[model samples]
Target chain A: GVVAAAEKTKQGVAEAAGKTKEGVLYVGSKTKEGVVHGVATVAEKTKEQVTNVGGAVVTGVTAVAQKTVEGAGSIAAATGFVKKDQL
Target chain B: GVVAAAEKTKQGVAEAAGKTKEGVLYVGSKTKEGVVHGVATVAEKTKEQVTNVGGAVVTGVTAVAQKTVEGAGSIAAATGFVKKDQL
Candidate 1:
């Protein structure tokens, strides 16, 4: 009975964790889409100048940072740092 | 010159994206650690009884949900819904 109880609890945790991961992944995807498009649009319009090279680098870095903010959920799952089961 | 310029911009974007992913991944890992511990502790301490199974499930689900909140960043990167590069 004790063992069964423990097993049940573990299952409960796994199922909940899986559902949570799914929701977070959705949010991360949307945020990434917005940031990527916004950055690309600006990059396309900018003119050539002395700082253009630096500007490109900066833009790239910012995009990457934004991506990180959005995708953190998946990364956690990948590492097994947070145990999760797929739906 | 335009070709070189375009290449430069792309390179900049990639580098920035890479760096951003790295940082977000770090944050996601930490958040996962906190959530995993928090959930595990609660599950362990609770009693075994009638509602114990249901309670375990609920507790597990909540932990997973919290984990998702913490890990949203990395998930975005994984999807390539946001392009990223290795650090």
Candidate 2:
């Protein structure tokens, strides 16, 4: 169902975006404190992870976007929107 | 100058990658507990910020890469690899 696809796609985007936003915000804090040596390696590990995650957010979005497109297309075909048969 | 540019670019990449990796790893801890209710909003804010930061990494890399290229070009021009008047 196109409607179903749309619903799921919208949900995925919302969840991904919301989750990613919050994820990076936390990274901001963790990263900002990297200059602090008081935490020992805790701060060091924190900085690397935040960078990893911040980069991951884009990865997640790209993945989600890819899946959303596929879902939309699949459902679009299901709903007679188009076909792989050159229609 | 080109050598200088390369040195700085390499340093930037090394520093960014290292810092970001550690940052996200810390976020990994800060985030894994988001589902936990013990810390209350600390967890909530952490999650959001992590999401926010996870995405910023690509941003930082992009910015870095862009600068690296410009620096390389500027120094290249200065070193006679190319000329402002197409010489």
Candidate 3:
């Protein structure tokens, strides 16, 4: 039962982590919409910029989260993302 | 030992989840900078827009993650954030 209980908590954390990743995707979509709305007045090339940068925001943020998950915050130490705001 | 193991696993998950949240903030900063780079040429007033939207992107994303942490993935069911891209 104890081992099972430990596994259960692991399952809970895994579920929570996955849910958070889904939210990251949501952030990406909304931010991209905002970009299109805010910047479409400027230039056509900026559209491409939005697609690339906005997409990177989604993927890069996702990378940090997943790396943190797998590396257990050692990502901060190894990747120099030690300060949350500096990166 | 099983109970202890369960607690340990919980600790690990919590640590990982917290680390991931840190990355969300990083995403916000980078995205905001990207917005400035992408849109600053348009107008100054739009800077205000970027601040609002970019900050919301950060806070909103953080909310989804923490809510998911507390409520589990039911955010999808209850909040109707079922589709990752729709938000």
Candidate 4:
């Protein structure tokens, strides 16, 4: 969200390819999707995961700001860093 | 740090062993610890690394407290999570 457009980093794409191998091992070791294009599926999932984090970071900043106002005075200064609203 | 006694976990000990390989490769690959006890020294460093993190969690709690009071109100409420004072 911050980077002009939410373009996926090349490293993220590569690391995703590597982790997908682990996922294939995980699934092939289990479920009945005997015809597993696990590599492609996992790559897609990893891309989604990266995109989700980006989306959350953008949207989550606002959530943090909203919580600051909502939980005002409900929290003690000792633990004030944690907002009850966020919880 | 809060452990009854600092004991390295089984996994930590094994990881400590593994990292020594990289250490040897690093030294033999370069500087004059060339007849390297890299494995043994790195193994010790790993144990120390685990111990250090544990130690920081324990001792660092105090440092956080010291900083809280030390940086009192200088930081916005958004970031201040603990007391600028203890008790």
Best by lDDT: 3
The window of 10 residues in a row where model 1 chain B has the poorest summed lDDT is B53-62
Tell me each candidate's RMSD, in Å, in order: 32.5, 30.4, 25.1, 26.7
What TM-score does chain B of candidate 4 reach? 0.11
Model 3 Cα lDDT, one tens digit per residue, A23-66? 23223322321121222232222211122222112111111111
Please identify model 2 stretches exceeding 4 Å from their true place.
A1-65, A69-87, B5-25, B29-87
Error of 4 at B17 (Å): 71
- DockQ winner between candidates 1 and 3: 3
Scanning candidate 3 chain A in windows of ten residues, the lowest lDDT window is A59-68
Better of 2 and 3 by DockQ: 3
Give the lDDT of residue A41 in candidate 4: 11
What pairs collide in candidate 4?
A81-B81, B68-B84, B69-B84
DockQ of each: 0.03, 0.03, 0.05, 0.02
Model 3 ranges off by over 4 Å: A1-48, A51-61, A64-87, B1-68, B72-87
Instruction: Give the alpha carbon lDDT tens digit for every residue of A2-72 in model 4.
Output: 11111223221111111111111122133221121112111111111112211111101111111121232
| B-chain TM-scores per prediction | 0.14, 0.10, 0.12, 0.11
TM-score of each: 0.12, 0.12, 0.13, 0.13
Tens-digit per-residue lDDT, A3-62, candidate 2: 111231212211111112222234323322111111111111223233343233331111
Residue A77 local lDDT, model 1: 21
Candidate 2 lDDT, B1-87, residue by residue in tens: 011111212122111111122223234233221111111111111122344422232211110000111222122111111112421
**Which should have the higher lDDT, number 1 or number 2?**
1
Model 1's chain B TM-score? 0.14
Give the number of the best model, judged by DockQ. Answer: 3
Q: Could you give the interface RMSD of each candidate, to one decimal? A: 32.5, 30.4, 25.1, 26.7
